Write a protein that binds this ligand. Sequence first.
Ligand SMILES: CC1(C)C(=O)NC(=O)c2c1ccc1nc(Cc3ccccc3)[nH]c21
Ligand SMILES: [Mg+2]
Ligand SMILES: [Zn+2]
Length: 313
Amino acid sequence: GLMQFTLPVRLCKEIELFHFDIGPFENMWPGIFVYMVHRSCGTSCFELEKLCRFIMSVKKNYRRVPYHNWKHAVTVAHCMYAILQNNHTLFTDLERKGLLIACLCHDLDHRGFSNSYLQKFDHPLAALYSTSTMEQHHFSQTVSILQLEGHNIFSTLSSSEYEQVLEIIRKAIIATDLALYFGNRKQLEEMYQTGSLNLNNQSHRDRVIGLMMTACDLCSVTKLWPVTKLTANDIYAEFWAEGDEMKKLGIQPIPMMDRDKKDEVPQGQLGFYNAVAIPCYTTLTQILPPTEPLLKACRDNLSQWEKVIRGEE
Ligand SMILES: CC1(C)C(=O)NC(=O)c2c1ccc1nc(Cc3ccccc3)[nH]c21
Ligand SMILES: [Mg+2]
Ligand SMILES: [Zn+2]
């Protein structure tokens, strides 16, 4: 109980900032997550032995894919940590518990393929879950690991609190389906502008937690340019492999997934920042003003992609 995790000074300071990169030392990532839980939630939230066993089972159930991997899980949890720490009083005790775990678990057992590809391949998971296919699978995998012996980090919650926290985690994980992002943000936009947004309305909180989940999920666009640029390569490594698998099924993939159309990537990043990223952090900044640095960093990275197109790099 008297056993804090402490980070070296540069990490202790920079981990508080939105643009923090967790670094290339895999063995430090479990400690960074526990550090973040202890400060975000409390040193009493989780039994340390159980938490540690949970983290290591989650790590084991992330695959060695270029982007949708263990490092993404921890990266997305760090962004949630930064949002929670900058919005201290807005979130319940159960919410701070649930959301850091939801983020860590949100892409469990990802294979590096979209819901679209699962459906066109006729993958078994596409027959078990007709929409938000991989996201229903990620929640399913989270519950599985929580039910491993000595892995129930929520064991001290009442029967009804346990149900609420698993309901927080399910919605948060489903919300990382980008197909659901567009309508969720439009609805949040209308509620904020017409003045009807109400954080005591559970259905409203749900929508706001969903946008936070999209914001954390896309947070590679809020890093320093060299982090953002190299992470973009990793996601395109997945996209191009999926395009290869589409061609093997006799389907010309969309240009984004076609490795013969790499030239079109800079313009695809513009569309993505304009259609997805900027609107996401804009609405988030309206609802939670302290998250403005994510919008500022995203805008700086858009400008960097515009410079790539203009041959200024
Ligand atoms: C943040 C990061 C890694 C990025 O830097 N650059 C991307 O392009 C990207 C990212 C994450 C998830 C992405 N999903 C898509 C596909 C998509 C395109 C248009 C509309 C919806 C969905 N692109 C993604
Ligand atoms: Mg996902
Ligand atoms: Zn993700």
